[PDB]
Every structure is written in C-alpha cells, then in structure tokens.
Amino acid sequence: IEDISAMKNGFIVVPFKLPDHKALPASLHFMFAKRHQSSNSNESDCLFLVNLPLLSNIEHMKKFVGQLCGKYDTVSHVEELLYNDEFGLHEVDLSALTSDLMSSPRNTALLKFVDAASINNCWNALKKYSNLHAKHPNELFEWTYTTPSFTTFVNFYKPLDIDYLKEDIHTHMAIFEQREAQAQEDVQSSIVDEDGFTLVVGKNTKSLNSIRKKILNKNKKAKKDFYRFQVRERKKQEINQ
Amino acid sequence: SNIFKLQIDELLEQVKLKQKHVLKVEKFLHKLYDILQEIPDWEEKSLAEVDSFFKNKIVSVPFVDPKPIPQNTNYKFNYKKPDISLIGSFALKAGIYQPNGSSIDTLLTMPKELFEKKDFLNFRCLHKRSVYLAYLTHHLLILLKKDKLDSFLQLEYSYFDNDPLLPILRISCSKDYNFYKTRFSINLLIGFPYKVFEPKKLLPNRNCIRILPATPLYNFSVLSSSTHENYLKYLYKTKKQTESFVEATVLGRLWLQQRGFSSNMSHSGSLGGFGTFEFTILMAALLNGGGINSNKILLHGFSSYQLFKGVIKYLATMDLCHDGHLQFHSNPASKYIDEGFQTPTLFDKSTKVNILTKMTVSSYQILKEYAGETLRMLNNVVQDQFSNIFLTNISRFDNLKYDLCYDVQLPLGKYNNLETSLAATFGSMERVKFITLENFLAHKITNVARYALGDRIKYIQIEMVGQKSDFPITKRKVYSNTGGNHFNFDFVRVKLIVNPSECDKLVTKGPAHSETMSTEAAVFKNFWGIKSSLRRFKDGSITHCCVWSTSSSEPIISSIVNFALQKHVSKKAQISNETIKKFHNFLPLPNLPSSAKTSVLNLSSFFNLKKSFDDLYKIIFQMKLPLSVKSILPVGSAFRYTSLCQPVPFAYSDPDFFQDVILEFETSPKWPDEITSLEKAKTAFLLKIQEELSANSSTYRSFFSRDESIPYNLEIVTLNILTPEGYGFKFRVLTERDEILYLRAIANARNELKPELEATFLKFTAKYLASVRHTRTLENISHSYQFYSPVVRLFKRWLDTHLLLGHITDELAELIAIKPFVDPAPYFIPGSLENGFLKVLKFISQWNWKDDPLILDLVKPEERLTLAQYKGIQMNFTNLRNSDPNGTHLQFFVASKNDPSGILYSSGIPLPIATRLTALAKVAVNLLQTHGLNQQTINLLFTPGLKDYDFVVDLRTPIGLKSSCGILSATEFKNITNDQAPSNFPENLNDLSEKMDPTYQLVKYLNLKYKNSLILSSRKYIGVNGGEKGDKNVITGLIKPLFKGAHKFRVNLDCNVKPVDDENVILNKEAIFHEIAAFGNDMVINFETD
Amino acid sequence: APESVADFERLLIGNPNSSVVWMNYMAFQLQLSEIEKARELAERALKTINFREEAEKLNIWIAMLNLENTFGTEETLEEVFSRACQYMDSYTIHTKLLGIYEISEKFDKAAELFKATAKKFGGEKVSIWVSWGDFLISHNEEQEARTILGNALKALPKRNHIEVVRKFAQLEFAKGDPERGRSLFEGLVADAPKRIDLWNVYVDQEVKAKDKKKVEDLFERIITKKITRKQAKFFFNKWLQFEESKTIEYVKAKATEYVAS
Amino acid sequence: TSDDYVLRIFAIAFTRKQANQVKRHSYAQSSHIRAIRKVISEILTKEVQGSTLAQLTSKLIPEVINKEIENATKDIFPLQNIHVRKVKLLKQPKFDVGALMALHGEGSGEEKGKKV
C-alpha cells in the first residue's frame, strides 16, 4: 500500500522520488517527521525526521522547502540540521574530551526554523502532503537533486588545496596559542581564594582544568615491641601456646 | 609430564576394545586351524601333470616371474601337513581398529622333508611355494564349499608386503554367522623351516643365480620366510621384561599409519617400507643395545613414553644407513658399528638377515627426518602438541605431505617390448640385483632424480598409482592392462619436498674442469650430454654446468625432471602437471621488463621500490626542519613483501600503491596539548617539508590527503610523494604525545563510551605503534621462509575473489599465512606455492574459535615466547572469551610476541564474514579430498562463489584498469601494453581519482552507514579479478537475521523503511539499491536480485 | 519453546540489543536459581549491548535492581547501585529503584532513603516528591506528608513552588484531605487567578473527587473571575458536558449573556 | 636486537658548563650520575630493542640517539656533547644468505660462453 498517511506514534510519512536508473524504471524514499523542542536555542521549534536519505544536507532541504513553498505557498526558511551524524563520524568529540577549547539521538535529523508559526504552517502542510502522497504518487510534492554527493563525496581521492589548509593552520594556531597562553598565565596567577587561601599551582603547569582533573584522578610504622601491654600480650601468647 | 600421561591413557582409550570383538574371529581361526590340522596330505608330483591338474579346474597357480619351463625341472614337490603357527600381532594382543582392518600373523611352516641343502637359488623353492599355496587354497575352498558357509566368507590371493616373491591368502568376508564388524581380513602365509644354513650363502653379499652381484630382496625374502621365530621368542621375553610394549607398539602404529608408513615396500614404488613390526623389533633390540659401548640404551623399568622417545631419538640422530648401523643377535651385547652398508640396515648375528631391507635409502631419509622433527616437537616444553603428533592424518591428503607432485604417463607395453620402449638395461644381471621391471624402474627413477637435482630437493619419494595387489584366484598374476602397459601401475607419481633456498637457481654447477677428465666429469657428460657445457664464472674458475631458461609460470625443476627423464627412462614418457601451472600464475603477472621470464622468488620490484625509498630517505634527512626528523621508517606492504601485485612504477590504480612510511620527530616538550592541535601541527610540519621539497628537488612531487581510518579526528592529514622513479609514498607523522593523549581521552571520558574509545585506540595502535614491530618481524622472517611472499600474494588473491578484503585486513591474512610456516607440527616448512597455499587452507578449515587461540612465535628455524608469557597469553585468551560467550564481535584471536593482546588485528570484522571464511575453508578442503586435485578443481575453487545472497550490484568504471594497474593480462603482444602503461605522472593532479577506482571508498562509507542492518562486501583489487579487460566489480552483501521479516518501527531501529503496515515496517530494497545507484550512476551498471 | 540455554544463546546472538529476552534468559538462570551466574550473564549483557540503546539499558537496570532487591545482599545492592549511578542517569535510576521498592513492599529503610535522596538531589526534581508524598498519604502518614511541605518550600524556588504544591494538592484530593488541598490551592488562587490550566485541572480534580456543592461554587465563580473569549467556551464545554454526563438553562442564559456584556 | 645479534653498545657523555655560570667547576653530584646513567641505559636499550641491525646502523649514522639522549636528559643536567663511540657485536644469529643479499640487492650468477 501507499495509502497510509500517518504512523502510530505521531510520525508523518514523507516519501520522495528516485532518478533514472540504468536497471529500474519506484519513486519512493520514505522518511518520518515530528514536531518537538527542548530548552536550548539550538533546538527551538524543531522537527525530527527519521530515515534521512544519503547526504540530504542543508541545500537539499532548501530545494525541498522551495518546492513546498511553490506548492502550498507556506512560510519556510531552513537553517541547519543538528545531529547530522548519519555516517558514524562525530559521535564522540576528542577535542572536548581532552581539551579546554570548545568544552562539552540516533541517525535522525533535527531541523529548526525561524518561527513557531512557520513550523506550524509547515507541519500542517506536511500532514496534507502526507495525505496527498497517500492518495496519489503522481501529483506529489518532490525534492530535486543537484547532488553535493557528486560534488564532494565520490571523488575523495583529491589533492587538498594548499592555500586552504595553510590559512586553516594559520588561523587555528593563531587562536589556539592565544587561548593556551591566557589559560597558562591565568593558572600561574590565581592567588586569591574568596577565604584567604592561596592555590598551590606547581611550576610550568598550564591549566586550572589540568590540575583539577589531576586532583580528581588522584583519589603507619607501629612497633611490635617496646610497650608494656604489648610485651605482656606477647609473653601471654608464649605462655598459652 | 603431568598431562601427557593422561593424554597417553586417553589415546589408549580411543581404542580399548580388545576383548569383545576378538573372540568371534579367533574362534573363526580356531575352526580354520582345526580344518588345517585335518587337511589330508599328498606325496611327490610332477610339474608336467600338476599343470593340467590345475588347468582342468577353475583355480590356477601364481608364479614368480617366470613360469618354470620343464627343461630345468629337477625339484621334487610335496604337499604336506603344515605345522600352523598363530603368532605375531594379535597373539601379542596389540589391537587397533582400522577401516581396512588389522591382521593376525598366521604361518603354515614348512615340514623338514621337502627342502634340501640348496634351497637358495633359481626360485624353484618359491615355485614350490606357489603351487603348494595353489593346492592348499583349492583344498580349502573345496572344504568351505562342502561345509556351506561360502555366502558370507570369501578368499583372495594377495602378495605379502606387496612383493611378488610371496603370494599369500587374504581371508575376508562380505555382507547368523556373517562377520562384518571388526578387522576385515586375516592373512595366511607360508614359510620355511628355521635351521637351514649359514650366512655365507644367506647374506645379501652373495650370488648363485645365473648371470656375483647382490641378491638383496631374494635372500631377504627367503630368510625372513625361514628364520622368524627367534623374533617372537625375543618379543615375548621383552614382554616378560617390561609391560610397556603393547602400548608402545600401538603408539608406533598410530604414528606410522598417520605418517602412511605401512608394511608394503618402498622398493616397489610405494610409500612405506618401514613397518610397525620392524618398529617393535628395533625397539626390542634398543632395550638392550644401541650404545657405542654396546650399552643398555632403554632400561626395561620405565614407562612407554620414555622408551618411545628413546627409539625416536635413536632413529632420529644416530645413523643406520650411511655412517654406522647396529648389529645384534637374538640368541651377549648388541654392537653399534661405525661403517655403513649403504642401505637402511641393522644386522643380526643369530639370524643373519637385514630387517630394514624392505625400505630404501629415500624412505630411510624421510623417516630419519620425520623422527628428528618429531623429537624436536616432543622435546619442547613451552607448548604441548600431542594432538599434533598423534591426531593428524597427513597421509589422507598426499599433496599436503609433499611440496610438489609430477606424473609419469608411460605406455611402455610388454615385458618383451622393453628395449625400444625404455632406455635402461635388461638382463639376468639386473634381474638378480632387483626383482621386476617396476622395481628396477623405481630404483632407476630414484637414482636419476637425485643425480638430476642434487641438493635442490630436500627429499624424494616415488610411488606407482594404479597398483593392485588384490589379484584373483584364477589369474596367475595381476594381469592388468594399465593404460599402455601390462604392468601394475596406471601411472608413476614422483613427489618431492624441495630445499626452497636454491630451489630456483638457474644454473647447476657440476664438477670443476681440469685437463685430466675425472670420473665425475665423465658421469656429468654422459648424464646431461647435449645441454651440458663448461663455463667460466665471474671469479675465474671453470665448471661444467647447465643453464636453465627460468620462467614465471613454472619452476625450473619441472623442465629439469622433464629432460632428465626423457633422456633416461623413456623418450616417450610424458610428464603431466597442470596444478602448478594453473595457480602459479594466479599471482598477477607484474608488467616489468622480462617478468614473465623471471622466477617467482625474485623480489627485484620490491628492491627497486626500496631503492627509490632510500633516495627519498636521504633527501628527507639532509634538509633542515625546526624540529628535525628523529627516525623515518617504512611500514608498508611492499616493504614487508606482501603486496598483491608486485609494485611496478607509475601504477596509480592499485590500492596497495601508496605505501605508508612514518616519521617520528625529536622528543620535544613543546608539542601542544589536545589532539586536534597536535594533528594540526603535524599538518604544519608536513606542509613545511613539502614546501622545501618543491623548493629544492623539483623532480619529486607532493600532494596532501585527508585520512579517515583513525576515527573521530577528521583533520589527520598525510602527504603523498610521487617520486620520479615511479612510486608513491604516504607519510604519517608520529609523536610521543599521541598514545598518552589517547590514554588521557580514555581516562577522562564518560563511562559508557569506554569500549568505543578503546576501539579507537585499538585502531590507532594498530596503525601507528605496533605495526612497526609487525613489519620488522615479518620482514626479517621472509628471508628464512622463502615462499611466504608468494603464499601471502596467493591468499590475498583468493580471498579477494571470495570477497572478504573489504572487511578483513592484511595482518590477519599475514599471520594466517605465517602459521604453517612457523608451526610445521604435522608437516614441513612449505617450499612450494601449492603446498603452502593448501597448508593455509587446511589449517583455517581445522581452525576452531572457542578453543584454538592462534599463538605465534615469529622466529627463524633452530627468540621465542617464554613459558610465563605463554601462560599469560593463555590466561588472556581464557578470561577474554569466557567473559565473551562465543564471539559476538571478537571472532578471531591472533597473538604474537609483537602483540600480547591478540585482538589487535581482528577487532572489527563481522560474524557473517568470519563464518563465511571458515565455512568456505571447510568447503574447499572436502572438495579437495573428494573431487581430487585437478586444474578444473583449482579453477572451480577459484570461482568467485557469489552464492547469491540478497543482491549483486555490478560496477563499471569507464577504463579497464590493467594498464594503469600494471599487470599484463597474459597478452602475447608486450608492446601493446608497453605503450599503454602511462609511465609518467600526470601534470595536473586532480585526474588521479578518475584514473583510480572509488569502489572501495564507496563500499566502506556504505558499510559504515548501514552497519547495523546489512553488511556489504566487494572486490578492491580490480585488475586481478575484474575480468581479462579488468573492469568489473561487485557489491555483494548479507541482510541481518533480525531484518529478514518485518519489524515494528521505533525511533531507533536504524534502517531505511518501507511503511506498508502502520507499525511493522520493512527495509525498502528498491530505495536502498536506488540510492546506491544514485551514488554510482557513473559506476554501477547492473543490479541482480536473489 | 525456549527451554534450553543453547536456544537462549542462539536468540541473544540473533539479536543482542533486545533486553527483554536478555533479562528473560537471566530470569531463566533465576528459574534454575543461579544468582552469581545471573550476575555474570548480566555483566556479559552490559559489555555486549550497543550502549546507544538507553531504553534497553534502562530495562537492564530494572533487571539489576530486581536481582539485588529480591535475591542478593543489600551490600551488593548498594554496590550495583553505585556502579549504576556512575554509569547512567542517576535521577531516573533513583526513582525507578524507589518504584521497585514500593512494588517489593519495603517501607522502613525506604522513608530514610527518601530523606537521603531529597538531601542529595530532591531540591530540583519532582518525581521524588510525587513518590514520597503518594507513599505517605497511602500508608497513612498524613502529618509527615504535610510536614514534607516545609522542606518542599525550603528546597524548591518560586519557579517550582506552584507545581510542587499543585501536585501536593492533586495527591491530597485523590487519596488525602480535600480541605487540606483546597487550603494549599487558594493561596495560588489569590496569587494568580488568570492562570487557566491550573483552574481547569482544579475543577477536574474536584469533579473526580465528587464534591457537588464545591464544584458548583467553582464553576459559578470561574466566569466571575477573569475570563476571555476562548476561556468562556472552554469552561462551558467542560461544564455543560460535566453536568450532562434544573441547573442547565441557568448557565445557558449566562453563556449567551456574556458574549454581549 | 630484534634479530639475534647482541651488542655491548656504549655511550659517553660530558657535563656542559651552563650559560651565565660563574663557578669553574660544573661537577655532577654523583647522585645525578646514577640518574643520568639509568635514563641513558634505559633509552638506548629501548632504541636497540625496537630495531633491527640495519635499522640500528641507519639510525646511528645521522647521529640521532645522541640528540635523543640530550633531549630526554636535559631536564636533569645540561650535558655537553653526547656520543656512543662503540658498538661491539658479541653473538651473531646465522648466515641467512638471502637476508644478506636483501641488504644490498639481488643477483643471479649465470652463463659465460664455453667456446670449446
């Protein structure tokens, strides 16, 4: 069937078309949808979509919502897809794991908008879009294909442009040595505690975070003789056995 | 010696039924010898009437060659009541259960009044024996047919020990009284009385048969037929001496029948010669003698393992053939003498026969070597191999035992057609030195083989396939026409194990040149003749030698044995081999100057690559850096000689082109803290060295490359140097801060990403730290194990055709291939591509996962892992996979000295791929053991084996990549690829992608995208298996057993969905294949389902 | 039917994420009564599951706390409790440990560890107040469940005060004293009667607590309080349907009077 | 080494007169001497045992364990010029003709014309 239009737990089905294949004549690329939010400003008025296509980035979303604003004439301005980790490359962050700079879901795409009435308009438009996709697969809203996959990720296999990574290492070292030096002098002169105390720092240590995590990671000679009661106990043990 | 005694008792307990199944067959022989006691006798007869007396019946008479003409008939025959002796093996009760069955020794001895003082000549005593067996077996079949038990029991003629001098009676059965459930035969023999004569007409150093050459098999056969009761008396007195003899002989029986050393003969062209009863006899002589001072060698007080290791040590390091043998007397010391008889020999001074004379010098050589290596593998204490010493049928598959095999298909014809068919001698002078045509032919083949090859072969063996000792009653011989000849072999198989060091030396330096032509120079001239020459070598000496035009599709030993048989045995004996020629060029033929004419042990492509690397090495040292290079060292596959194709210059499209060299700088403290900034500083240093390289040395070139194998840091950048010699190198900077940065990350990370980050650290120390030690150890070992580089090349080819290289890595394949090279426990160190490759396949079919950790100690022959480290590896294994149930992700466990963790190279591959490898090895070994080794068998093994599982997607890049991959396709026109291999790096560098192939990166990104729901395998070396044009690749792959039927959807089921039911969705195959095709519209052409 | 451990091993190898049959095989080892071997299979499940599946990990923590509540010693219970709080989300595994406690019917130490958990983290989470107040009002500790409000108004700020006394009022309307709950809620009535959802759930709680004259007084004072054009028809679609499912035309008059003046 | 060669490998070291010094002495305290000798034996034991003999020559020629000693040992004392000055082989593994030919380049001695 294609006549299904809304899932069990509120998910809205939004399928897509397929191009011309040299061995197939189709035109379905399924996808779910959900409105949601969290407390932070990166995830305001946002939409879950589960089963993202292979490399459907921001530009692909622009073309899709441009076709949508051609069809239903709604309000739609997309900016970014948080948690675009469909490969398996950016789950952990080593830099935030062992550094000071830039301190601190599954296969989804969380896409936020510019207005709550915009996500309301797009969500109700999307429900009607799911219904028309259920009824007819020919009069359907569709997202085209100019393929940044073809521009970037088929031809990996490439010399890197020297001016690009040279200005990148220049800018990254320029901000990194600055923040490292200011953290070093900040831990080297951090004398005042609010109650009288002076923090022992050690020589040439570079960070308050470093000594903090070190002190988190870092978490007698009695005699058997020479006392009267102990030599009484010893001679009592010798008397007994 | 705490677990080995328990292993000995369990090996006994493998067969301990010597009471139940022995009683019925012994009452069968009780009835038999009662019938033999009541056989009525006969008086003297004539040959010229017993010939018609057997002509008119159906039973006929056998004969030693030839039948007696009545001109020489002056012997007086008899048919008496024989004293019957139920002796030997099951008299000692040394039971073994065999599919072909043991046999009780039972002898009809000869009465004293049908022999005389001259029973040692002209085989009329053996003719008497033939006619006496003929009438006694006719009498016994008559008595069986009147007693009416013919329907289950039957009787056959057979040779004793496959020897035509003594035909014997094979009493067997068939399908209330039918015997079918134990050893399927007994053997009735006929023998001569004991006190006959004295050793001067009884030694193998006499002759009285007409032309004094030696009569070795003659006076061995008749003397063992006459005087073999002191053996039994001595056997039972040693039985009364100690009790370990029966366990000792079943130990030796299992040993020698897994070695294939049955009691037939080696003189007949068969493996064997040595026998288990000869092992018992030599052991019983070694419990009193064997020393230089005629010492007690084995005390009769200790248990079976000590005397077993004693007799193995004595026939391992002390010589019996060449320099020394042991004389002895059963009825008083036994003396080791230092002179040799130039035969496998031990002497008797109370019997005066030589008990080892059933074998030749070649079989004694291979037995002494087997004894030496089994002494070596029993002496070692760090690891026990009782299951490798007594639980391996190395004789079930014969080509596993020997390095290479050839066939001699010769239609020689008739016994009188000898002269024009074969170029060897003919007469009674040779027919008294030997026995028959095949006997002196096999001896001639041994002599011409060892003089044709010299010390280019370790050991030589020869057998006659198509031999049939089971000749019927009514026929006077095995009178079989075995495909061109009237002799008992279909063809003649010659097997060699070869010395792999000088196995392919293209000249064979014979004797030196002088004015007085010496006898060995005359021998060499008459032996080679038209292809001998005398040359000066570069030092200045002059030597007779023979040049050999070497080749890649053959070893030169093929052409040498071809010419040295077609000059000596027959000028029409066709040598047929095709297995070597079939998967000796399954290695890709590297498009080099004359590389088809070069050998396969040549490594000159690797050495040319290392010469270009030394040029780059000097250039990268003598420049100047702000923190100079401490140590630059290669780690690559060409540097460890295990690249699939040999690296030809300018070959872009091979994925094993860019070898990786690493460089470590000085230990400076000014490295930054976190991983992105130190990796960015590594990019800064690489940018500096490529800037100065393009500044000062314009003949090289450089281009950068992102890396992605070390995960969660996208900023790891290598550079790649394109050198003017034609090779490319991938430079990786290592720092001292790296592994402590990763340990910092491991320590401070959250408590649920710990095994994930440990997998990242595993990939890091597999690529950077320990891979240096890995390539050092195997590059050092690949000079004493010579065939290691071709067997790794062949194994990588075979695994690429069977579609595993996408998941599996190189280091598993390399340690798998180095396992039979360093652990020869059932076999030898492999000296041929065939023997090595099927050794690897046999091992990984044998390979368990739950109770077979793969421990290696990478060391040259004659350091290792110590005992405490071996116990530590075992403890690591047992706690590792008792915490692990059955390997949900940790399938293979491969430990060495370089890595005691074991999981360093195997972590990551999926259970479907690992199970596919093990099941495919099982398929290959049963296919080889039943369908037989053949060229069509080898090609059907090296079929791709799609075994269609849920999809096959067929690729097409627009260029057949043989030209840019650098392998000629066995094209007969060398020029058409000499002008086609683009021997110049391109000016623009953004064309490298479209002259390369992207299919491995596509299948890798697709596998890590859909890693939970379907796995994807591919081919990656497209030139070696992508067709003759070299343009084809597939993307095959299994769907998970979870995702077979539909599954209810949630927020985290992690799959492309086809929602048709409102809850239970399925993966939309058309959508996933169509996004694959959208990813590869320029790449894929075809899709096949099912 | 799965009755053999080889078949259970086959099922867990066929799917490793499914903590339902993971815990079922560990409970099969409980059916053969092996608590230590069940803990071995437990840590095997911990090392084998894909750690991203937090809900099935939560069901594994149900299994851990069930094992160390019903069979093991309480020192091993606090051991696996400590490793749980250092592995996964501490507040949720705290409140489901309390849920397993109230199912297993232990109270004496449970109230003292209620106090301990309120000292640790109770000042900014509300399910602890839910479980503690409901446990006390059901187990007849009305005075203790009234003096919990002192520590509630102590630890919680003004942002959460309205919600903690609202859920206090809900619990003491359902299984407590409605005059106590009304004494709690009329302060917020005087604070902000403009708030509409609290008023609607308050008249709903009085409907389900079945006080006829008090729900009459609430539904005849709501329109006298501040009411806008949505709130009027919203509370009338509550009120007419509550009285349907004479005093109907008496409010039908005002429902069309207030749309004019 | 990683092969079966064993080396009595030596190392010599000298005290640096530190810059801006005044005193003529520059003596080591002889409990720094045990520390310097311990760290120098440890690090050159590591530099041998993580290498083969050809690699040991190719890392001894451009004089880099000297600078490695100076970098890893400048923390304790200033340490003027470091050298190794002696490598004595005491036991050799075997011949391995193929390995020795691999250290140079391959070669196959073949025909010269008979003409007689």
GROMACS .gro file of N, CA and C in nm, chain C residues 203-261:
model
  177
 1534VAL      N    1  -1.084   2.221   3.889
 1534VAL     CA    2  -1.225   2.183   3.881
 1534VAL      C    3  -1.239   2.039   3.833
 1535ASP      N    4  -1.142   1.988   3.755
 1535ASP     CA    5  -1.145   1.848   3.716
 1535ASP      C    6  -1.117   1.756   3.835
 1536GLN      N    7  -1.021   1.793   3.920
 1536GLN     CA    8  -0.991   1.715   4.040
 1536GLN      C    9  -1.108   1.717   4.137
 1537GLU      N   10  -1.180   1.830   4.144
 1537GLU     CA   11  -1.300   1.833   4.228
 1537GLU      C   12  -1.413   1.751   4.167
 1538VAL      N   13  -1.420   1.742   4.034
 1538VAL     CA   14  -1.516   1.654   3.968
 1538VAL      C   15  -1.488   1.508   4.003
 1539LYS      N   16  -1.361   1.467   3.992
 1539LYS     CA   17  -1.327   1.327   4.021
 1539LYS      C   18  -1.328   1.296   4.170
 1540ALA      N   19  -1.313   1.396   4.257
 1540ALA     CA   20  -1.327   1.375   4.400
 1540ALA      C   21  -1.471   1.388   4.448
 1541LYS      N   22  -1.562   1.432   4.360
 1541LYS     CA   23  -1.708   1.424   4.378
 1541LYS      C   24  -1.755   1.506   4.499
 1542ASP      N   25  -1.732   1.637   4.491
 1542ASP     CA   26  -1.789   1.734   4.583
 1542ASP      C   27  -1.884   1.822   4.502
 1543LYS      N   28  -2.014   1.796   4.516
 1543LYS     CA   29  -2.115   1.857   4.429
 1543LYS      C   30  -2.124   2.008   4.450
 1544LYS      N   31  -2.141   2.052   4.575
 1544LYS     CA   32  -2.157   2.195   4.601
 1544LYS      C   33  -2.028   2.272   4.577
 1545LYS      N   34  -1.913   2.209   4.602
 1545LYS     CA   35  -1.786   2.278   4.578
 1545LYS      C   36  -1.757   2.291   4.429
 1546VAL      N   37  -1.793   2.191   4.349
 1546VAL     CA   38  -1.772   2.207   4.206
 1546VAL      C   39  -1.877   2.302   4.146
 1547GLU      N   40  -1.995   2.313   4.210
 1547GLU     CA   41  -2.091   2.416   4.172
 1547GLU      C   42  -2.034   2.556   4.199
 1548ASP      N   43  -1.974   2.575   4.317
 1548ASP     CA   44  -1.918   2.704   4.354
 1548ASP      C   45  -1.799   2.740   4.265
 1549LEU      N   46  -1.716   2.642   4.231
 1549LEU     CA   47  -1.603   2.666   4.142
 1549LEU      C   48  -1.650   2.702   4.001
 1550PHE      N   49  -1.749   2.629   3.949
 1550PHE     CA   50  -1.797   2.654   3.814
 1550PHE      C   51  -1.888   2.775   3.804
 1551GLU      N   52  -1.935   2.830   3.917
 1551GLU     CA   53  -2.006   2.956   3.914
 1551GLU      C   54  -1.921   3.074   3.961
 1552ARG      N   55  -1.799   3.049   4.008
 1552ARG     CA   56  -1.705   3.157   4.033
 1552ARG      C   57  -1.601   3.175   3.923
 1553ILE      N   58  -1.585   3.075   3.834
 1553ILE     CA   59  -1.484   3.087   3.728
 1553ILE      C   60  -1.518   3.201   3.633
 1554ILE      N   61  -1.645   3.216   3.595
 1554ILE     CA   62  -1.682   3.321   3.499
 1554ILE      C   63  -1.680   3.458   3.568
 1555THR      N   64  -1.706   3.461   3.699
 1555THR     CA   65  -1.690   3.584   3.775
 1555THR      C   66  -1.543   3.623   3.786
 1556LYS      N   67  -1.452   3.525   3.784
 1556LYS     CA   68  -1.310   3.554   3.772
 1556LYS      C   69  -1.276   3.594   3.628
 1557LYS      N   70  -1.148   3.623   3.604
 1557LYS     CA   71  -1.105   3.677   3.475
 1557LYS      C   72  -1.114   3.570   3.367
 1558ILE      N   73  -1.193   3.598   3.263
 1558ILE     CA   74  -1.227   3.501   3.159
 1558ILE      C   75  -1.229   3.572   3.024
 1559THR      N   76  -1.160   3.516   2.926
 1559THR     CA   77  -1.152   3.571   2.792
 1559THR      C   78  -1.237   3.484   2.698
 1560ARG      N   79  -1.237   3.518   2.568
 1560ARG     CA   80  -1.330   3.462   2.471
 1560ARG      C   81  -1.306   3.315   2.442
 1561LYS      N   82  -1.184   3.265   2.463
 1561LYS     CA   83  -1.160   3.122   2.449
 1561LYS      C   84  -1.192   3.050   2.579
 1562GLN      N   85  -1.159   3.114   2.692
 1562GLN     CA   86  -1.174   3.054   2.823
 1562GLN      C   87  -1.320   3.035   2.860
 1563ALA      N   88  -1.408   3.124   2.812
 1563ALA     CA   89  -1.551   3.112   2.837
 1563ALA      C   90  -1.608   2.984   2.777
 1564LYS      N   91  -1.597   2.968   2.645
 1564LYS     CA   92  -1.648   2.849   2.578
 1564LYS      C   93  -1.569   2.724   2.615
 1565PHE      N   94  -1.443   2.738   2.657
 1565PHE     CA   95  -1.365   2.624   2.704
 1565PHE      C   96  -1.422   2.569   2.835
 1566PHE      N   97  -1.443   2.656   2.933
 1566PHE     CA   98  -1.501   2.611   3.059
 1566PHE      C   99  -1.649   2.576   3.045
 1567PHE      N  100  -1.719   2.630   2.945
 1567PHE     CA  101  -1.857   2.588   2.923
 1567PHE      C  102  -1.865   2.452   2.856
 1568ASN      N  103  -1.772   2.422   2.765
 1568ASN     CA  104  -1.759   2.288   2.708
 1568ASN      C  105  -1.709   2.187   2.810
 1569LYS      N  106  -1.646   2.234   2.918
 1569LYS     CA  107  -1.625   2.146   3.033
 1569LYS      C  108  -1.753   2.130   3.115
 1570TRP      N  109  -1.821   2.241   3.143
 1570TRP     CA  110  -1.924   2.249   3.246
 1570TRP      C  111  -2.055   2.184   3.201
 1571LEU      N  112  -2.101   2.216   3.080
 1571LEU     CA  113  -2.225   2.158   3.029
 1571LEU      C  114  -2.212   2.008   3.006
 1572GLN      N  115  -2.094   1.963   2.961
 1572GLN     CA  116  -2.071   1.820   2.944
 1572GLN      C  117  -2.055   1.747   3.077
 1573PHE      N  118  -1.999   1.814   3.179
 1573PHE     CA  119  -1.992   1.753   3.312
 1573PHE      C  120  -2.131   1.741   3.374
 1574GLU      N  121  -2.215   1.843   3.358
 1574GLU     CA  122  -2.349   1.835   3.415
 1574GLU      C  123  -2.443   1.749   3.332
 1575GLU      N  124  -2.417   1.734   3.202
 1575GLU     CA  125  -2.496   1.643   3.120
 1575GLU      C  126  -2.460   1.498   3.150
 1576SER      N  127  -2.331   1.465   3.146
 1576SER     CA  128  -2.285   1.329   3.167
 1576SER      C  129  -2.277   1.295   3.315
 1577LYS      N  130  -3.364   2.228   3.805
 1577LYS     CA  131  -3.276   2.225   3.690
 1577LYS      C  132  -3.170   2.333   3.700
 1578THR      N  133  -3.050   2.305   3.648
 1578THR     CA  134  -2.939   2.399   3.656
 1578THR      C  135  -2.859   2.404   3.526
 1579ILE      N  136  -2.924   2.381   3.413
 1579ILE     CA  137  -2.860   2.384   3.282
 1579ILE      C  138  -2.895   2.512   3.206
 1580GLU      N  139  -3.024   2.547   3.202
 1580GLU     CA  140  -3.067   2.670   3.137
 1580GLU      C  141  -3.024   2.794   3.216
 1581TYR      N  142  -2.998   2.778   3.346
 1581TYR     CA  143  -2.949   2.888   3.429
 1581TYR      C  144  -2.810   2.934   3.388
 1582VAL      N  145  -2.727   2.843   3.337
 1582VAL     CA  146  -2.597   2.882   3.281
 1582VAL      C  147  -2.604   2.898   3.129
 1583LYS      N  148  -2.705   2.840   3.063
 1583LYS     CA  149  -2.727   2.868   2.921
 1583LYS      C  150  -2.767   3.013   2.898
 1584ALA      N  151  -2.833   3.074   2.997
 1584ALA     CA  152  -2.862   3.217   2.992
 1584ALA      C  153  -2.734   3.300   2.997
 1585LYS      N  154  -2.643   3.268   3.090
 1585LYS     CA  155  -2.522   3.348   3.105
 1585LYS      C  156  -2.420   3.321   2.994
 1586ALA      N  157  -2.424   3.203   2.932
 1586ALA     CA  158  -2.331   3.171   2.825
 1586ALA      C  159  -2.357   3.253   2.699
 1587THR      N  160  -2.479   3.304   2.683
 1587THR     CA  161  -2.512   3.396   2.575
 1587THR      C  162  -2.526   3.540   2.626
 1588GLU      N  163  -2.535   3.559   2.758
 1588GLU     CA  164  -2.529   3.694   2.812
 1588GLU      C  165  -2.388   3.751   2.807
 1589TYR      N  166  -2.287   3.669   2.837
 1589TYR     CA  167  -2.150   3.719   2.846
 1589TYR      C  168  -2.085   3.742   2.711
 1590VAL      N  169  -2.144   3.691   2.602
 1590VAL     CA  170  -2.093   3.724   2.469
 1590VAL      C  171  -2.142   3.859   2.422
 1591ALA      N  172  -2.238   3.919   2.492
 1591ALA     CA  173  -2.284   4.055   2.466
 1591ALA      C  174  -2.232   4.154   2.568
 1592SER      N  175  -2.242   4.122   2.696
 1592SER     CA  176  -2.190   4.210   2.800
 1592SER      C  177  -2.140   4.132   2.921
   0.00000   0.00000   0.00000
